[PDB]
Ligand binder design. Sequence first.
Ligand SMILES: O=c1[nH]ccc2oc(-c3ccncc3)cc12
Lengths: 24, 347
Amino acid sequence: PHRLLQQLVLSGNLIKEAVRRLHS
Amino acid sequence: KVTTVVATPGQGPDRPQEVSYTDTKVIGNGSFGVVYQAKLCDSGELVAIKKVLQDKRFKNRELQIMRKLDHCNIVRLRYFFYSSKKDEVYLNLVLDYVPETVYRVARHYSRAKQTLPVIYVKLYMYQLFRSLAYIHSFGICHRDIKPQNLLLDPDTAVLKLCDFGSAKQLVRGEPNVSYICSRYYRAPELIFGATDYTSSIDVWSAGCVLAELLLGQPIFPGDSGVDQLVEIIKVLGTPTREQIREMNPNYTEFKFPQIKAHPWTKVFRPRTPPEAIALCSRLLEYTPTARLTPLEACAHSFFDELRDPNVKLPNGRDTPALFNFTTQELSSNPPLATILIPPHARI
Ligand SMILES: O=c1[nH]ccc2oc(-c3ccncc3)cc12
């Protein structure tokens, strides 16, 4: 999550993915 | 050996002078550089020497910051000198030596499966907030607040903030790097990629230290950048659309599952002092402007015991100086001085 975090921020899916990883 | 150098006083002068030191010993090494421990020849006083590789046609941010600062809760820059691979230049920061860190003390109790005495939690955190009040009044943001950067004199319980290698004088409108601060203590706006953040990221990190002192372990132990947010969401839930805008106006997420915050009272052990939890809830806010200022944090009810005339350290000793405030330190809210300085503290 360095390039992954960058992607998430750029694609506007950061929270969506974090919530998914909560797992859930 | 006895090493003699020409070094400039961190205070100013700034007129160079011969400084001699001995008993040189490596006590730290990283990508930043090397930290030595040494003994001054005329004083016998111990010092730390931070050696950093310097871009010779540029100025050092840490040096320029360190030269401005003079505060009982900040590590004192005694001298600085340059050396000397052939054409390579190293900047040497000569600092007052302090033997312990909040990290190593907290780790001790943690490994002993017990919590740090509440009085120390008040003492260290209050001194932390003071140091922050001080540096923020210059517009300087530390950007690396963590237990490892909080030095402790174990006898006197004096805390000194150190390691200004990430610090920056923040100017509104001028962007700042987002990938900053040690992960566990990194403010959520930084994870969201904010470049227009403020000194309130230090308050978030201070809140993380507080929580860690209460838990015996980091509150948000992320395994990565994204997982760091996962950890935050477990406690705070998801941010509102308004909190997202407040954190990073350039970030947009139209759809996401909303999650409610976990109650603060269940985050901590049942016997955690309710006032410590209350303070924590006012520091660990998504909205950067909603967090307490360091001064406001100093004036919080949780630190009431520190303002009690009869307060003592568990070792019998009197507490360090807590009320020697300056105009610079009080500048964000000058009237708070009458609450911060209790009647027995005045001259
Ligand atoms: O800036 C830093 N980066 C890493 C280690 C370190 O240790 C000190 C220090 C200062 C005073 N006494 C002991 C250690 C500063 C410092």
